[PDB]
């Protein structure tokens, strides 16, 4: 709104910020850089006047309530990234309004990271898989227990700071408040992560599409390439069948029962073991078989999730991030997290580190 000029160019604007009461703040930023495109809109980069912090700000277009919005000023938890400011500009198209999102600053993602092993033929150290997949499921298992489902689960959506090992959920654009009877649209989840119950048409579906999407992070994180490469909405659950089988008669009512139960050519499940290379952490596979499952109500829980003895190695005391540092907050839990299996809290915190309430 009001563009100065003292270092060069200075933004000026009154911003309303996120989490807080609604008390509009005078709130100037500079660096501004393109650091995104796509249909949703822009993404900036920028450096705050006062804090000198750095932030991103997405620019949308809006008409008339957001939900992206709505939902990014109800949360607060440190795995996902913050809503630091909002405020309403204009640009691309006049006439029209624009909803200008500042939030957290993160360097890198888990993509990006994944993606440097891979190419060296290389496979990600196990304590940076434990790491990277336990905080996202706490940012799950804190985000589920309002009803919220993010419905866009990829690695290109885990934020990641590589010296503090932090990992920051974004993108909530694609979120929704999931209520037990409406239903919702089933082209939703990016085609990799999808779950079967969506590739089946299922508008019942819950918060376990997340979950799926989850373990196959897990999984291409294990692998080295996305378990289920579909080439499009047919392949995805070719590909699935591949690893996972055929689905059961009762698989099939319990992913989406409108459905009418057909007979498929019954291929047989290929062993977890034979999926993964050789010396693949045995837990690392369990955890796997428990979260790529066809019914949804068979799939962990992210907090069950949390607690699966693949990441006992976070829990040990004498645990540090290979750089030497110390691992990031791992069992800050608030009682809204372990609100859902509330015995798991002293089985999640552990003894060293009960002080966590
Ligand atoms: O959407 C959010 O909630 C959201 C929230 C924060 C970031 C973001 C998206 N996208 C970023 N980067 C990015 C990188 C490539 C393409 C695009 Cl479109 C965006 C980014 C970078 C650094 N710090 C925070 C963010
Ligand atoms: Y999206
Ligand atoms: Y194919």
Same mark, same amino acid.
């Given at each position: 709104?009001?563009?100065?000029?003292?270092?060069?160019?200075?933004?000026?604007?009154?911003?309303?910020?996120?989490?807080?009461?609604?008390?509009? *703040?005078?709130?100037?930023?500079?660096?501004?850089?393109?650091?995104?495109?796509?249909?949703?809109?822009?993404?900036?980069?920028?450096?705050?006047?006062?804090?000198?912090?750095?932030?991103?700000?997405?620019?949308?277009?809006?008409?008339?309530?957001?939900? %992206?919005?709505?939902?990014?000023?109800?949360?607060?938890?440190?795995?996902?990234?913050?809503?630091?400011?909002?405020?309403?500009?204009?640009?691309?198209?006049?006439?029209?309004? $624009?909803?200008?999102?500042?939030?957290?600053?993160?360097? %890198?993602?888990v993509?990006?990271v994944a993606?440097?092993?891979?190419?060296?033929?290389?496979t990600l150290p196990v304590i940076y898989v434990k790491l990277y997949m336990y905080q996202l499921f706490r940012?799950?298992?804190?985000?589920?227990?309002?009803?919220?489902?993010?419905?866009?689960?990829?690695?290109?959506?885990?934020?990641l700071?590589?010296?503090?090992a932090?990992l920051?959920?974004?993108?909530?654009?694609?979120?929704?408040?999931?209520?037990?009877?409406?239903?919702?649209?089933? $082209?939703?989840?990016?085609?990799?992560?999808?779950?079967? !119950?969506?590739?089946?048409?299922?508008?019942? $579906?819950?918060?376990?599409?997340?979950?799926?999407?989850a373990?196959?992070v897990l999984?291409?994180l294990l692998?080295?390439?996305?378990?289920?490469?579909?080439?499009?909405?047919?392949? *995805?659950?070719?590909?699935?069948?591949?690893?996972?089988?055929?689905?059961?008669?009762?698989?099939?009512? !319990?992913?989406?029962?409108?459905?009418? !139960?057909?007979?498929?050519? *019954?291929?047989?499940?290929?062993?977890?073991?034979?999926?993964?290379?050789?010396?693949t952490p045995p837990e690392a596979i369990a955890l796997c078989?428990?979260?790529?499952?066809?019914?949804?109500?068979?799939?962990?829980?992210?907090? !069950?999730a949390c607690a699966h003895s693949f990441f006992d190695e976070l829990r040990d005391?004498?645990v540090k991030l290979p750089?030497?540092?110390?691992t990031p907050?791992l069992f800050?839990?608030?009682? *809204?997290?372990?609100?859902?299996?509330?015995?798991?809290?002293?089985?999640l915190?552990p003894?060293?580190?009960?002080?966590?309430?």
């Amino acid at each position: 709104v009001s563009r100065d000029k003292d270092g060069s160019k200075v933004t000026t604007v009154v911003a309303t910020p996120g989490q807080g009461p609604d008390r509009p *703040q005078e709130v100037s930023y500079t660096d501004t850089k393109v650091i995104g495109n796509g249909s949703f809109g822009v993404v900036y980069q920028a450096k705050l006047c006062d804090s000198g912090e750095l932030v991103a700000i997405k620019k949308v277009l809006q008409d008339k309530k957001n939900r %992206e919005l709505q939902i990014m000023r109800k949360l607060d938890h440190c795995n996902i990234v913050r809503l630091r400011y909002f405020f309403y500009s204009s640009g691309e198209k006049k006439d029209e309004v $624009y909803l200008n999102l500042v939030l957290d600053y993160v360097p %890198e993602t888990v993509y990006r990271v994944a993606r440097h092993y891979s190419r060296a033929k290389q496979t990600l150290p196990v304590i940076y898989v434990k790491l990277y997949m336990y905080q996202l499921f706490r940012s799950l298992a804190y985000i589920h227990s309002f009803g919220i489902c993010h419905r866009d689960i990829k690695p290109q959506n885990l934020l990641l700071d590589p010296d503090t090992a932090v990992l920051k959920l974004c993108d909530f654009g694609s979120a929704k408040q999931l209520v037990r009877g409406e239903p919702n649209v089933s $082209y939703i989840c990016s085609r990799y992560y999808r779950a079967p !119950e969506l590739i089946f048409g299922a508008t019942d $579906y819950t918060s376990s599409i997340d979950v799926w999407s989850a373990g196959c992070v897990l999984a291409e994180l294990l692998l080295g390439q996305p378990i289920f490469p579909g080439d499009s909405g047919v392949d *995805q659950l070719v590909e699935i069948i591949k690893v996972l089988g055929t689905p059961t008669r009762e698989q099939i009512r !319990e992913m989406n029962p409108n459905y009418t !139960e057909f007979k498929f050519p *019954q291929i047989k499940a290929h062993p977890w073991t034979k999926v993964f290379r050789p010396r693949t952490p045995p837990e690392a596979i369990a955890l796997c078989s428990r979260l790529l499952e066809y019914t949804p109500t068979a799939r962990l829980t992210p907090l !069950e999730a949390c607690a699966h003895s693949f990441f006992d190695e976070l829990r040990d005391p004498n645990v540090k991030l290979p750089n030497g540092r110390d691992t990031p907050a791992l069992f800050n839990f608030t009682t *809204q997290e372990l609100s859902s299996n509330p015995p798991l809290a002293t089985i999640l915190i552990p003894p060293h580190a009960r002080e966590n309430l």
